[model samples]
Every structure is written in C-alpha cells, then in structure tokens.
Target chain A: NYVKVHQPLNVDLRTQKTQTKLYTVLERFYVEDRTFESISIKDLCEQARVSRATFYRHHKEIIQVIEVQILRTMQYFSLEFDQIILTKENIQRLILRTIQKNPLLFQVIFWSRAENIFIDVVSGEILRISLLKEVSFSDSKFMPNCFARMILSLAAEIQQSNKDYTNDQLVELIQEAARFLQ
Target chain B: NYVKVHQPLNVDLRTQKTQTKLYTVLERFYVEDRTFESISIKDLCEQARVSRATFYRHHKEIIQVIEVQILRTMQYFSLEFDQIILTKENIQRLILRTIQKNPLLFQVIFWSRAENIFIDVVSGEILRISLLKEVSFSDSKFMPNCFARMILSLAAEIQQSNKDYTNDQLVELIQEAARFLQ
Candidate 1:
C-alpha cells in the first residue's frame, strides 16, 4: 500500500517560523500510519527527513506531535459525519467503513495509545449533540453505560470473531444487542 | 470522620462460615478520626486486635475492601438517579452535592486515586455513550481527535480549576464552552 509523506520542509526556515511544516509532516505521518502504538521525536524526524534540531525547533516533544496528528484525524472524522446519530446500525457502519479504509491503523488505534482518544473524541461529540435533542433510551440510567460497554466489547470481539460476517450480518448483531439494551 | 472497614471476604453462609470474630476486630479498627489512606493493614490489625492470619481470612488486601465500599457507593448513586438523563446540569448538581455531603472524601478523591477513576471511568463512560450516538459535526475529519483532546484537557483543567470554582460555576463554564463547539 502507498503511504503519504508530509510536504517538504524548507531547510532554511527560521526557528518557530513555520507551523505549516509541522502540520504537513503530521498530516503525512498520520496518513501513512495513524495507528502506530507509539512514535518518538527520532522516528518523526526520520520520517519527516528533518534533523533533530529542526524537529525540536518546530515542536516540543513526541507526545505533543502524536496528540496533534491524532486530534487532526479525529477532527476530520467528526466533520465527515456531523449528523450521524448514535444508533446501533449507524455505529456499526461507521466502524466497518473506518476499519476497511485503514485496517492497520484501526488495529493499532483500538489496541494502543489512541484507545482512550478513540473513545473520548467520538463520545464527547455525542454528549454535546445529545444535549441538543432527544436520544434513544434517554431516560434509562444504564443505557449509556450498557451501550458503551456493549459497543466496546463488540469492537473487541470483532478483532477476533473468526467470521467476517457481511455488513448485513453485523447490523443484525447490532440490532440484537440493542434489543437487549432496551 | 468515621470510616467503615468493610469485611472483604466472599463467604457463603450456607457453606463455609465467615469468620465473624475476625470481622468484629476489623470493624473496631476503622473507628474514630482516620482517613483510609493514612492507615495501613498492620495498623488495622493492631487496632482490631486480630492476628494477620485472621485479617487475611477476611480481606485479601486493603484495596479489596476499599473496592467493595466504592462499588456500594456506585450502586447507591446509580439507584438514586436511575432515570435521570445525565445532562450538564445533573452532573453539576451531583458534583455540588458530593462536595457538600463529604468534603473530606471529595478532597481526597479529587486529589488522588479516586480522581483518576472519576475522570477515566466517568468521562470514559460518557464519551463511549456519546460515540454510540449519531451526531453530525461541521467538520467530520477533525472531530474525533479534537474531541478526545478536549476530554483530556478538560480533565487536566478540572483537576486544577475545581479547587477555585464552585460546581455551579463549572457547570456554567461547560455550558459556555458547548456554544463554541463546531
């Protein structure tokens, strides 16, 4: 598979003069391998084809750089499905599409550092939007937790479920689970 | 402030009897003005006037008993608000009431282990639930990462700011921030 590299950095750019390079590098790095468990300054510098001094000049640390890249990716996803509600079917579709699009990254994300980020970013958006309108089982105290845990467990199960069930089958599974939730 | 030393042993009354003598000693140990953190198992046994063997018969460790107490507390809260939709206002009231009811536990929980559980568990639960919902954002691409960072930053901020602001003000802050989300 082809990987996207960030836009080239100007060798002569002054210190703290160009955040665009950082964003470009991050975008490229993430596009190439967004779900890598960990990436360090050394790895980033090598990937960006920059010297350590240059990398440090643009950003503080590896964690900050990783956070930026992850956040940017999340922002992209959130914008893509602004009106998508948290129904069982919709959530399954989104997950399947995301995984199919970035299989390796999907594995790394759910299993590694991006785990918390994956849950929180999507969930935060949900809570905010839920505040604006009605929700399923809105009055049930356990619905949120039950749904959350079920979705998470489903994700975990899919990683090893042996059966590559068709999309329709997955939707069926989601519906069956949702029935239990109700 | 009084603290309850819960008997941590999992016993069957119809089968192997629980060592009641051991439990009696453990109960007396937690009496009077002592925070959970300050007391050690040795101190507990000394106060309860039981041998370590007897203590072990009841509790595997200090944390086990603490976990039981915490779960019971969670059960109470869950039952109390079984039908309440967790809006920003409800959470704000809960926070305020929590502070009002147990200023010391609040302070301790805020500063230490309980805080980690609260932010990681509670925020995580909310986020997971939200993600299971279907909401559209203006910029789908940037949403996930942004939302994740938002939760982390908020956790870090709340840890620091909660010391200065009342729960009411915190709720207002959240309300104001929600307006700026796109």
Candidate 2:
C-alpha cells in the first residue's frame, strides 16, 4: 500500500479549478476585444480579476495559457477519438469540434498567422491514430506520410473556407466530409 | 494585319529538328552512361557525331537543351490531360504517363537534384486542376503557392508501391478515395 503520497494531491483540485478559470478568462479576453499578441500580463490579471502572482502561478507567459487552451481543446478531441478508426468521419469530427470549441481562436489564428503548425500537429495526430493500421513511413514518400500530408492540406482547406459559415454550419460541412470515407 | 516584316522570315525548323534529335541523343547518352552534370557539349556532339557549331545552331547552352526536353515533356502531358479533370483518377494517369514517357528523366529527377522542384511543380499543377471539383486549400491556410503538393506526395507513394500497378489499379485507388467526398 505504498502510494507515494508526499502531500495531499486531491487538495490541489481547488487550485486546478482556479487555474482553469484563469485560463478561460484570459482566452475570453483574447477572443472578444483585444488580440492575444496585444494582451499584456497586467491586462490579463485585471481582466481575470486575479492577482499577478496567481496569474504567474498558472502560466509562465500568456502564450503558455493560450497553448494550454489549445491543448485542452485537443485533449477533448483525443479523448473522444480514442480507439476510433481514422476513417474520414472521426477526423471530420475533430475539426468540427475544434472549430466549435475555439471559434475565435480558429478565426484569428487561421486568418492572421502561420497556423499550419497547429493544423499539422492535430492532423498528424489524427492520421497516426486513425490510420494506425497502415504501414508507417520511414521517409516522406511513404503512404502514411502522404496521407498525413493530404489530411493536413485538407484540414487547412476546411478552415480557410468562407468565414460567413457559422460554427455549426461549418461543423455540419465537416461532418459530411468526415463521412467521406464511409 | 499590316505589321511590317523588318527582319527576314527566318524559319529555323531544320535547326530545331536537329536540336530535338541532338537533345534526344544527349539524353540517351546521359541515361546510358554519364551524369547530367558531367555530360559536356563535346561529349554530346561526339556521341551524336555533330559539331559544337551544329549544337549551338539551335540552343545556346546544354542546360537550354535540357530545358527544351522538359518543356516538350510537359507539353505532352498538358495535351494528354487537356480534358482530363484533375480528379484522383486523372492524377494517377498523369503520374503514370509522365513516368512512362520519361522513366529515366522521372527516376533521375525524382531521386536526384530536381526532386524538390519537380515535386513542387507537379503538386502545384495537381492542386490547381483538382480544385476545379475536388476540395483543397485554395484561398486559405494550406494554399501552397503551387497546388501540386498533394499530387506530388501521392505520386511518391505510388512509386513506392514497388510493383508498378497498371493504370487500372492506380485509377481504382483514386476512384475509391473519391467516395470519401460524396
């Protein structure tokens, strides 16, 4: 029964909730009025109604908070997609859910900056997980690699579609596309 | 239609034909014996039993002749593909035709110095043509400067399949992929 408990780890749940709230508050700040790049630490703390130390406790920098939000959003996708075969449908759900959960983030990151890195990482995960049955690539010329490239390219296309489509509408489009393999 | 012919109507069709023959001979020489970089004008003319003056009669440089061969190859592709939609099926045919027409050139270029550039050009063409109907990153995040990225990647995969599947097999794969879209 040696469950190495140096401290009461369960007690940190309260702190976790606080940190989550802080991250959400900053995300809302970044989304609504000001840009994430324009956001300052003081502004974040003020916006979140948290002290500077409390803000620093959760994130080393504002970018880290933003990264965490994205990672968290991705976590939701991964959990939902666990053990699922990577046909077109699951990947489509990943995209639709991602856009829905982080609409402003999607709009801003996709439109304003080099966000293909994000798409690549996410799409790469989807490809690897979904196409786990396929042979892996030792080089760029392999099928998995090619499939991954196509998936990344396809995801980028979906994101870049006309912005007039609402999140739900876009998700619906993605859902249809996801069913492409079916 | 009254444009004055200030210069002689110099029809160099004979020189052009000779140039074409020389290029064919030199390319054969390169494939049969030497590296493209090492194949000199002297070597080319010696192999074809032509003089440097005759070689220069149509092309200014060896690289220029190389360029002409490539352009001619591409022209052949364009003609063959003029009406063929750049769907998954047509892309397979394009890749096959290109490889069949210039197996040596395709093998050497794809495996050698021109690999990156070749992939870029081909991928760009595939993307542009496919966008006529298929989904792709056109105006958005993944819009490659050359639309041929996916096509290039797919081509490499087909090359690796090792057994050189017939047109029917390759076309079948494309047709299967098309099902995902609808």
Candidate 3:
C-alpha cells in the first residue's frame, strides 16, 4: 500500500525564485510550443538566465523540472478538491478547471514522452477521489480502479481530440460511461 | 481507421546484416542493462563496429533501432496468433511463450521509455484477437477496448514482478482475470 506520498513543497526563498524563473521560461519556451521532445538544456538555461550549474544543482534533467511542476500543481489542487463533495457532475468541472488553470502543462505532459508517467500519477488522484464518494469498496477494488482508469482514458482522449464539450455534456458522458461497473 | 502500418523490414542483404549488428549491440549494451534512457548512439555504433556514417545512412535515432526490432517481432507473431483458436488459456501460453522467446526485449520494453509505444502496439494486437472471438462491435468499441487494456496492464505487471508462474497457473490466472469482460 505504500506509494509516493507527496508532501508539501518546502523550499527556501532563493530556490523558489529560481524555480519561478525556470518554470516561466519552461512554459514560455517549451511547454507552450509543444516541441517537448526537442527541449534543449542549453536553451533552457540561457533563456531562463539560470546557469547550467544552477539548473543541474537542483534538477538533473528537464523531465524532472516538468515533473515537479506537475506534481506541485496537483498537490496544490488536492486540498481544494478534498473540501468539495464529488459527484460525476461537479468533478468534471473541478477537473476541467484544474486543467484550465494549467492547460500548458497538461497538454505538454499528454503530448510528450511523459504520458505514461502522467497516466500513473493522474490515475492515483482519481482513485483517491473515487474513495471520497459514498460507494463502498470492501468487497473489491474493481469499481474504483475501473472508474479511475475510465476517467484517465477520457483525460488522454480529450487532449488529442481537441473537441469542445460543455460541462453538462461531460457530465452526461461520465454517467453513460459509468454503466460498465461504477 | 488508417494507422502507421509497419511493413516488413525491407532492406538489402547488406543493410540487414548491419541491422543484425546493431540489434545485437542494442540488446547486449542497452536493453539487457535496463539503461534504456541512457542509450548512446556512439556506444551502439562502436560496439556494433558500424561507422557513424553507416548508422546514419539507415537510422536517424537510437530509438528507431529498438522500435524496428520490436515491431518486426510482433509482425512475425501476428500470423501464428491468427491461426490459433482464441481461448484465454492457450492464449496466455501463446503470449507467455512469445515473451519467453524474447524475454530480453519484453523486459526492456516495459522497463524503458518505449513502454507507451509497446502498450499501443500490443493493445492493437489483442483487440484484433478479441474480434476473432465471435464478438460483434457494431454498437460500441467498449468491450474490445476494455479487454485489450486489461491484458495490456497484466503484461505490464508480469514483467515488473519477475515471478516464475507455470503455464497452468498462468491459464488459471487469465481465466479469473477474464471475468470482468472477456
């Protein structure tokens, strides 16, 4: 049952400032453009005005830079998400809003080599939220796993399809998809 | 419906010989060690005794070398799989035998950055086999999709666990796991 339990991002002021600079440059240069696989460490360092040494001090690779930003944002949302009651109806909006706030990162993640990692990470979030419902899972983990994977696949499809579905439409979609198990 | 249909590796005898050299070096130096992400073009060429010029003449990236071997093996298996009747029992052995014959590649694939690609490729194969089981899909592609993903996840799991389950045990495992949909 032990998993990567993400603690809060506790960093000194100076490190946080470099993170800001690097993340800003990351978004502006790479994430926004969707040229994810072509990311150059030299370009990132030069554009962010952080030296290569500085970049390497806290981060080993560009993937970790993107990974941390993703985890931190998800971490930020977990508390707010916990406070609200989840229905198939509202959670879509909650999830959509989370993506809306950080569209670049989500798009980049799903589009890039990091998608496998994203699926693992996001599926867990959905599984955790799946437990927040009134549904009991003492008999088997089947329902929770199914529901989480279903939404995770939807999340994967949504990015690639580029279709604009309204909130109600998404709610309707979830309800229909829930038939198999949930 | 059109996809990147991989054709048989069409190359001259000379080219095939070079391919053989590269693939041997690949399995030995990179795949077996599980240092997939750290694969070096220079190392591959040096060990294979192929010059950089010759390597670049056919392949552009290190990833392509591994990808081609994977696809070619799957393509080789497709015809035989088609000949067999679909039973979860025999199919597990069929699949297991396939992995056993090429354990190095299978292990490398799941443990590598190439895993997402492998999942997409193998899921397509399982979905094709599902269609041969007298299943109709005019209504929705849902059941086929679910079964393919379930098997794909199991394939992913079996590699990571490094278990030594026998053929009959694997058959029983598949039979139980097939309950949700198959």
Candidate 4:
C-alpha cells in the first residue's frame, strides 16, 4: 500500500453539467439576439440556471467562457498544424474547415467587439505553434510575426464576411495574397 | 481681365452633392445602428434624401459608400506618411488621429463584415506608400507587406473596441505590437 499506484482523479460530473449549461445559454444568447457586451452576468446565470458562485468559480468574466471555447478550437488547429505538411494549401484548408464547422462562433469572434482579444489570442497561438515547428521565415523581407499576422487577418477577413467560399476558393484567395508577398 | 474668370461645372456640383448625401446617410446608418450587410441601397438612398437613380449612378453596391470613405482616409494617411519620418511612432500617431477623428466609421470599416474589403484596401495603400517612401523592413523577418498588414490590423482592433483609451494610449498599444515584430 505504501508503494501506492498513481491514480488519476475522476472527472467532476457536476462541474461538467454546469459548464455545458453555461455554454448553451451563452451560445443561444450570441446567436439569437446580442453580442457579449450587452448581456449581464446575472441574466446569464438566470438563463443558464447556474448559481452565481459556480459561475464565478468557473469564469472571472463572460469572455473567459468564450476564451475557453476559443482555446479548444486553437487546440484542434494545433493538431491540424502538426499533421499537415506546412503549405499554403494545407493552411487554408484547415482554416476554412474550422470556420465552416462553427461559422457562428467564428463570425462573432472575428466581427464582434470580441475581435481584438480573439484575433490577438488566435494569431499568438498560431505564431507560437509555428515557431515550435521551426517554420522558416528566413526568406521573409518583413517581420515573421507580422507575416503570420497578415495571413491570420486575411483568413479572419474571409471568415468574417458572409461569403460562402469553398475551401478551394478560400485557398486561392490566400495564395493570391501570398503571391503578393513574393 | 486681371481677375480670373470662374467656370462652374454643373456636373461637378450635382455629382458632388449626390456623393455627399450618400456619404452622410451611410455614415449615419453605420454609426447609429447596424453594419453594411443589414441595410439596403433603397433604404440608404431614402435615408440620405438622394434618389435611387443617383445612388446607382454613384455606387454599384452599398459597401461602395464605405469604400469611398476608406479611400479618403487612406489618402489623408498617405499624405501624412509622406510628411513624417516613417518611424513607428509617427505611423502610430497618424493611425490614432485618423481613428479618433472618425471612430465610428473606422469601427464599421475595420470591425464590421465590410472588414474584408476595408483591411485589404487599407493595407495595400500603406504598403504602396511604404514602397514609395522606402520604409525599411530590414529588421523584420516577415514579408514587408505582411508587416504593414499586421500594423493596420492592430490599429483596426484598437479602433474597433469601445475601450476608452486616449489617442496616446492607443498609439502606445500599436507601438507595443510593432516592437514585438523587431
């Protein structure tokens, strides 16, 4: 018994339910009527049927909920970046697919007041991952961070618009921009 | 004979008024209520007290109003850049002043769905001017075009937010972002 096994703690089912309920309520609010700024925490708690204390424990601000979701999306893209053979086509495909999968959230994040924080975080995440991957910026005539950011903003611009561009079309648009860089 | 004779071009006056009326109306719509997507040309014309025929003669789409304003903003910034020493601080000051002068318009163009067109055009203008001015991207590891874009986006993001930062603070934020690229 003294040479005890290292056991993992069981997931908290209650916390899971609370988080789901909070997410559902927030998503519905964003979709149906308003942006995040207009809504109050009390109203959100009432709508989600979660206690104030629980809400506080989970998130310091309303954006934290969104931040968590965005983090998850970033995490998924991180994996996508890992497997892909770092080309313009692959980057465009991954971005287009991610946006297509959750158009509303992406739209809100990119087009809403949340855009400042969201874009900064997303671009930072992408840049960090790229740095870790050792993507060559040696040939660039501009700052590599700025270059990554430009690519991000272009993707963000396309995503923000209500354009129903296919992945191929989106890739072409990004590649066109890339061509301009050269 | 010594006094210059004035030639009034009837075409200029009427077209000028039409452009002004359209600009005023579109600016109001963007500031008071929604982004470009929700409003129609008919609605805009009516609101501006300009006829649909006049609007059609001037613009092909609703976004053209925004495009015109953006172009003007870019032109002014272009001139400002021409006069300045082409340092990061000067660039920040120019952007901050432009946004401060017309926060709502900048917010709509940069953060609204119209951002796709607006950002591309704005960044292109900056890049073109940089080329003419021979602004150095020598220290940057990114493409120079992308560097311009990243700077534009940072300014756009700050402009988009309702955060009540002073012009100096906004310029500082943009400068901080620029420092990161170096």
Candidate 5:
C-alpha cells in the first residue's frame, strides 16, 4: 500500500478564473482605449472587480498579467508543437493559425506594449523548438537567435497589414526568408 | 520699394546646449542605472543639471526628450543618406558605418526604449531613401514597411551580438536578407 503514485498538484480553479478576468480586462482596454502602461492595477481590479488583495497575490506588475496571457497562448502552441514534426512550414502554419484563432488576443500581444514581451518569449520558444529538432534555417546568415527574432518581426508585420495578407500567403513570406530545414 | 535683405533667426544656442546635456544624461543613466521609465523627469533634471524649468520649457514629457535625441541621430543619417546612391548595400553600409562611428549613441538608440523611436524614424528614413531612388528588396514578399522593419530586426541582432559579429559581416547578413534593387 506504500507504493507512491505520481500525483500533480492542481492550480486553484478560482485562481485561474481571477487571472483570466484580469487578462481579459486588460485585453479589452488595450483594444478600446489605452496601452497597459496607462491601465493601473487599481483600474484592473475595479474593471475586473477582482479585489486588489487577490490581484497583488497573483502579480506584482501589470506586465505579469500580460505575460501570463502570452504564456497561456504559448501553452497551446507548445501542446500542438509536440504533436508535429518541427519544420519551418509547420512552425509558420502553427503561429498563423494561432493568430487567426484568437485575433483579439493576437492583436493585444502583437500590437500593444505587450509586443516586447510577446517577442521575447515567443522567439525563445521558437528557438527552443528548433533546437530540440536540431534544425536551422538555410537562408539566414545570422545566428539561431537572430533568425528566431526575424520570425517575430515578420509576425508583427502580419498584424499591421489590416487584412492585406492572409495566413497562407504570409507563411510563404516567412518560409521564403528563412528556408528552414527539417 | 525697400527690398528686403534678410538675416536668418537662430535658435538660442543655449537651448541646444541644455537639450544636449539632458540627452547625454539620459543616455548615461540608461546605460548604467535604468530605463527612461524608471528614470524620472526629476532624476533627469538633477543628473543633467538642467533646471526642471528649462526641461519643461522644451518638453512636456520624458518621451519628447528621448524623441529629440532620436531625431538628432536621424538628422545625421538624413544628411548622409541624401548623399548616397540608396542601394541595399549602400544603405546597409551607411548604417553600419554610422554604428561604428558612434557606438554609444547607436547602442542607446538600438538598445533602449528609444528603440521604437529608432525603428520608427530610421525605417522611415530607409524607406524614404529607397523611394527616392525608386528601389525595393526583390527577395521580400511583404510590403515596403514590413521589409523596412525586417531590416531593423537584423540591425538589433547585430547590436545584441557583443563583438561576436562585425558590422561589415552583419551588413552581408542584411544584404543576404532582402537582395534590394539599385
């Protein structure tokens, strides 16, 4: 009876709900009126109606809330990332699909002050995936990190285009630059 | 008819002196202590020894001071950019030479919150020069803006390398990217 099971602790469901509300509130304001720089923790608490005590318990800065939202997005990307063979086409397809799926969150992530946060984390993640697959782009003369960041610059351009380009077409633009290897 | 012979009005050279000091102080502190956000108007005035009154006289916000610093850098670039042939190699060579010439200000412009300012102004400058010369990067599928920002991304990678890559080598990295037309 003493054989141990590999049990995992679950994050509180209530904790998850509050954080989601915090992220949603921030995303809405970033879309409608202001950047997260102008949206204070007080405004977040009042708008989301989450208590300041709970807000502070979850995060020390406004950026953390945004970072969590991005991590959540990456969690989904990571999930699918493992299911497929990592290639430039797949990577581009994955990201473009994610943007199309959640254009609002993608807008906030790509367009607002959350941009640097998005670029920092996502590029690292892209680099990580490429490394794990032992892959590198043939067309890039720069290092892997530089190549990863180049992908981010391209992604941001897609956001700025106002429907001028589609996911399928832009993936070609991304693939065209790097010619990433299997 | 009293035909007019005109003497040009001049900016108070003292005004130029104070703004220079303010920009220098911000650049030093941003290199050493903090970002423009963490370094306040009070801190800037105190460190630069420009009275807050003079600081306020010239600028309404901290960003305007940083914007002026960026504008000043672009002023130099604009001067040289006009003299050049505005090919990809020429533009890349012009920027790399500028970075080599003033590594510190170039570091501040590329590395700090002034980055978006740098990108905004320089990409526009690059695009302007290309337009004047009736040029485009043949390899890129995206629009001129996306292409311009891609260049900024590569330029930032060069800055992040910390002597691992030389400016001349990196210009080749940049040239390999877009393959711009003359």
Candidate 6:
C-alpha cells in the first residue's frame, strides 16, 4: 500500500519574514478577487516582494503555498490530538484553539478556495481516530467523513460570522450535531 | 444576493449516443487508474472514439465531464425530492431509488475525487429544503448542510459494498443515524 505522505515546507521559506509577506500578499489578493484562479505567479511575486525564482523554489504552484500552510496547521493538530483525549469538548477546543492561535493563516485558508482541504484534514483525522478505536457503524464506513464535514462546516460558519456565539456555544452546537453518532 | 450556481454542461454535447460513449470511456479509465487526475483528453478522445475538437467543444477539462454528470444526476434528485415527502423513510427511499436508477454514475462519483461534489449537491439540497421550512437547529445555520453530508455519506457507503443489505435495511441505518436531529 502507498504510504500517506505530507510534503514538507522548504526551510528557506520557513522564515517568519517570508511567510508573513506571502500570507499578506495572499490575503490582499483573496480579499479582492476571492479566488486564486485568476491570480498569476508574477502578481504574487510582485505583491509579496519576492522574486519568481524564490517563489518557484518554495512552491511549484501558487496553490501549493496554501497546501503547505494547511499541512503545517494539520501537523500541529495531529500532534495535539495525539496528546489529548478525543472527547467532543476536546475536539471542539482543539479546533477553536488552533484557529485562535493562527487566525491569519486560517482566515486566508477558510475564506478562500482551499476550504476543501480544511474539511478533509479535520475529517480525515476524525476517521483515523475512529478507525483506530474500531468504531463500528450500522451503515457506512464514510460516516466519520460526513461527521467531520458537518463539524468543520459549523466551525467555519462560526469563524466567518459575527462571532455572536462563545466557543462553548460552538462546542455545544457540534456536540448536539454529533449526538447522532452515539 | 448572488445565487449559488453550478456550471451548466454544453448543450451541443447532450446527445445520448455521445454521452454514453464518453461515460463508457470514463468508466474504463476510472476503473483502471482509480482516479481522473492522470487521465488526459487525448486518452479519453481515443478511447471514446471522439475527436479532440469534439471533446473540447463539450468540456474544457476532464473534471468538467464529471461535474456535468453530477449536475444532471442532482437535477433528477432535486425533482424527485420535490415530488416526494421529506420524512426520514421517504428521504431514504428517494436516495436509494436514485442510486438504483444510476448505479454506475453514483458509484463513479462516490468512489473518486469527485465525491466532494456528491456531498455538496446533497448537502446543498438539504440546506435549501431546511431553509424553506425554517427548521431550527440549536447550533448554526449550516446545520442542514452537515445533516445532508452525514446522510449522503451513508447512502454512498451502502451503494459501495456489501449489497447483501436490502434497501429497507439501508433506510433503517440512515434513520438511526439521523435520530440526533430529534
């Protein structure tokens, strides 16, 4: 079987100066156009104050930058989830705290097209954890994927909105929705 | 303010003979590689016995073909859901029947990367229906989307394997999972 692999970010690209500059450029582009479909490499390079060679050295495509960002974020989540108990509250806290810690990184990701990766990372983790525990469902193996999608959708909704609810409120919302799993 | 839109398939490409040929070619490709990522237009055209110009006239990319297929399949689901009641049993029957009608199409969509579209279309329908009825959730406005994802994931799972289970059994599984809504 093929092993699950995550592409590591370049050390040269890992400096705060480079990461912030790239994120800032992306944030502006996304805020204006709301998608990466039309944005060109030249545009990103010019806006980020980085050379094309540097950009290419770090990422083969503009989209891969976001992928790296997502991977790094998920890497943190992966380690944290391994360390903590996987209760409903803990899951909720884990997600909210991750977002709180890296709001800019996440805002760029969630507000843009890479949202699918966000859902997949979270849901993949859910399925992995559930599978390890040998959780059985009467119906589908994909139940965990669906459950993860639901929770991530709710979490994204909370993050995008007026912030009218507390973290606990968001946690309760996911808890109620996840009740069906039991 | 803006309506959610799915890109329409090219009208000139709607001929049944052509559609069948393309789908057969795609089915073969998908079964072999287990992905559309590596399949090229040249390969598809040759397999389907269609010209490259014809393929381009119909679809800008291979993924668009899947998108068109999903949209058409969803169009049917939309009409059927409208014609039927939204009770738990009725919903289950509606989905099961749709898959029964288009097993190959549903199977390809469910098993591949295009699976996201399957989840999204169903979830979108669920959200739309819930919104019209003003169904309340303790958590978030996006709750119906989550509910839909969970249901479709189960339905897709059933279509996938262990066809030993009857349609009624499948319905019961979804019903049990959906109980959290109550």
Residue range B121-163, candidate 2, lDDT tens digits: 5445445544543555646535654335554555567666667
Tens digits of per-residue lDDT for model 3 on A1-182?
11222333444445554665677677776536658667788988888778889889999988777666666567646533433333545556777656544567766665556765665666566556445433456545555555545655666666667687666777677668667456
Docking class of 3: incorrect
Off by over 4 Å in 1: A1-39, A50-70, A80-88, A134-152, B1-182
Q: Report the error of model 3 at residue A163, Å.
A: 3.4
Off by over 4 Å in 3: A1-9, A31-34, A86-88, A124-149, A180-182, B1-182
For model 5, what is the error of residue B103's alpha carbon versus the real structure, in angstroms, after optimal superposition? 54
Better of 1 and 6 by lDDT: 6
lDDT of 1: 0.47
**lDDT (C-alpha) at residue A151 in model 1:** 50
For each candidate, give its TM-score against the true structure: 0.33, 0.35, 0.41, 0.41, 0.42, 0.40
- Cα lDDT tens digits for candidate 6, A53-152: 8788777887667766665557646433543334657766877666555566656766556777766666666666556556666656567667667655
Among all windows of ten consecutive residues in candidate 4 chain A, which has the lowest summed lDDT?
A: A1-10
Off by over 4 Å in 6: A1-182, B1-20, B31-35, B132-141, B179-182
Which window of ten consecutive residues has the lowest lDDT sum in model 4 chain B? B1-10
Docking class of 2: incorrect
True contacts kept of 6: 0.00
Residue pairs in candidate 3 whose N, alpha carbon or C atoms collide under 3 angstroms: none
Off by over 4 Å in 4: A1-17, A110-112, A136-152, A159-162, B1-182
Q: TM-score of B chain for each model? A: 0.45, 0.58, 0.71, 0.71, 0.71, 0.70
Q: Rate the local accuracy (lDDT) of all candidates.
A: 0.47, 0.53, 0.61, 0.61, 0.62, 0.62
> How many backbone clashes can be found in candidate 5?
0
Q: lDDT tens string, model 5, A1-182? A: 11111112243445655667787787778768686567788887898888898888767887787787777667556644443333567666776777665667766765456666776676666656555556676632345456546655665666677767777787676666557752
**Alpha carbon lDDT at A84, candidate 4:** 38
- Chain A TM-score per model, please list them: 0.55, 0.56, 0.71, 0.74, 0.75, 0.67
